[PDB]
Design a protein around this ligand. Sequence first.
Ligand SMILES: Nc1ncnc2c1ncn2[C@@H]1O[C@H](COP(=O)(O)O)[C@@H](NC(=O)[C@@H](N)CCC(=O)O)[C@H]1O
Length: 803
Amino acid sequence: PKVAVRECGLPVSAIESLCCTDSFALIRRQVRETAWLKGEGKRLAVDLGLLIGERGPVLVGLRRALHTGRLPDAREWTPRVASALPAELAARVADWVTRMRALTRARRELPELFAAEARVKEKVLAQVAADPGFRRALSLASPELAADLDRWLAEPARRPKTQKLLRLAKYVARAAVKTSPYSTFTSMGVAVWENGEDWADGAIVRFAPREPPSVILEPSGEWLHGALRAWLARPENLVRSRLRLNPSLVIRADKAEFLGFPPREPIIRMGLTPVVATVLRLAEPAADADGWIDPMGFRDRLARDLPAEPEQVDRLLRSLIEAGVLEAHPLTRAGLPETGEWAEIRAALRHDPHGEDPEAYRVRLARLKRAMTMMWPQGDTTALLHETAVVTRPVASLNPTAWGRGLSDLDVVRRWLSVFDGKLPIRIVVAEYLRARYGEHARVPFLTFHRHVQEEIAGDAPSGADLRTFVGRSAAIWAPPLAHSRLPRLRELAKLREAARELALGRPEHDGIQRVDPEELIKQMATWPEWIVVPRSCACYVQPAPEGRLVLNVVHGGHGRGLRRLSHLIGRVRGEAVDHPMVADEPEGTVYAELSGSLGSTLNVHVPGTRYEIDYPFSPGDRSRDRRLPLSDLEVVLAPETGLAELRSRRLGFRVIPLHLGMAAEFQLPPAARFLERAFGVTYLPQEVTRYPRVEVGRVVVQRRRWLAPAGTLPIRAKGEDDASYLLRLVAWTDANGIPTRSFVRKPLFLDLANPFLVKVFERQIRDCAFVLFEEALPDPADAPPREGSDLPRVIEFLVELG
Ligand SMILES: Nc1ncnc2c1ncn2[C@@H]1O[C@H](COP(=O)(O)O)[C@@H](NC(=O)[C@@H](N)CCC(=O)O)[C@H]1O
């Protein structure tokens, strides 16, 4: 079970140190003492009223004060009144009055204490934000705010505006508690399993001495490919290019059908002249041993098979390239040969930054950005540069006996979550289209199927209705409109989902936890029909929590997706590749094949991890010609076992399972690739305060405890000069509703009520919000796994690949 670890770049002490510990402890005492006094007051009013009617004024007024929570008037609580009561009631009343008086004075003290503590935390914020790793991450993410931080550090007691402080505090929180790839903010490395036995400890994990992260700077894939195509279109770079036939090209005995340039990937049908048709035929023998076509020898080769005239062998070739039938690619791995502008880019990208302070980093990046735009425009490209932080040595060892039950529970969970996959309706609808248009035993060239489906989506007919609903632009009509659908299997799916949900939720809440036994989900699964197929491998992102819990954040496709990028980034930093193991082709008659090349994204560059590959129009791969399945070679058939559409190689017979193993999001995939993944891939991806409990499937936390608060329930700073009195009212409301001190509020906001910065960020974000969802912080930052020496505890997250 292959494992990686993502670690926050700031230690937990970084956000702990921003808490106003003294005044919050007093805010908490006050809130609990106010609630206890008000409760006790009302109970003492009951007992006093009993006493009143046991006799048969003053008492009626004292009663009224206790009931309503105010100090009794001097005339309502006197030695005589205390005399007319039973000693135990008199003493209870006495204690209440004392405590009420103490509470009132402590209410008066609080605002100066809190204000003074909050203000001291301003300098603690700069202390925490001084970290070099953090300033570097911030410098990429937010350069002006980062320069302002650098000035603050150089000029202390140059107290920046509140709004800058809130922005800094938010990034600090991100870097201390959020395990998302955002830039130097977190870093990633591999974990290993270490010899049970050595864990008398009790630890589930043990960390090596902290390796300083190494950083890899990369250009926007979209920038890169726009600039590359620009260069490949210029006449002089034909001799610096190789050519190949577009692997979507299909000659339909008359016309050429193919897919054109990304990102709008038009489906193209064009008329062949007999000369163009012969040009396309002679591309075959003109090809390399690996399919590439030397353009010079091809222009001659054409000169002496057509008539001679080179002047128009060139324009004909040019017209084929501009059209997309023949693809121009550069001569070398990643970038262009060594042309002037490209070797500067490539070197500046590669520049080892060592010893560089954040201001020099900012300067350097701004300069690189310019050279990029004085070459191909940014356009609407958001971010021209990304950075990623990795470590080269294993970061941690894992305790295989303490992990054990958790991984077992996780596998059961991983399988059961298949029923919820947002691609299942797609599969069902696509399969039904196949059956309806072409017949149960039909075998449809993939490209013709893609075109037909796309025609249905663009047009108007009821034959296209389901495709438009589930495969078209839309999440659905309202929610995924199953249950009341024409297709039986969409309705069977809806009931299978409802039964899955009701099995999970049909159980008691004890201490805010509903606990599902994994064997219950195994029992439910043995019942499912064959058209729910469980992926063979999943990347499970989990965070450990107390009592051996794994909190599941995210599942995606496995097969090394994620890990393969990590191996390739480590390989770049070390200067030697990591042999990530290959995907096994199984059962016989089935192969797994990733899409060739990187499909326009730097997040798809990785250890090539499938034997064969789907050879994809403008995204050449790195495989022997015999190991390429061109789009032209794929067909779509209905499988008898599942009744779902599958892919076959016409040339070789195998069932072909398309894989996306790069880290590009599915919407960044060009259209036919997106369709392949969505349709053929085997991965998945009121009126008062309402509490939803946490849901665990033995030790795997599948849903964290939550609290839903409508707009109207949540305290609002009355801008009648409200100040710290606000925190008091907010903490009174949260405590009364069981909302913990630390939570993630809905990208979720980390809220520490003790942190004066995060409370204000919270105040500001939630205005004009219809609902506010609080989620327990689990693991809590305080629960971060311990360390040795001077390495401070950090929040972490594991990528665990389960197979
Ligand atoms: N209830 C809660 N308890 C405790 N930790 C919570 C948490 N909710 C989020 N986290 C953390 O913060 C992160 C979301 O913040 P954001 O990056 O989306 O803005 C989470 N990270 C992830 O889920 C990762 N899979 C990466 C997600 C991605 O790539 O977008 C958590 O680390």
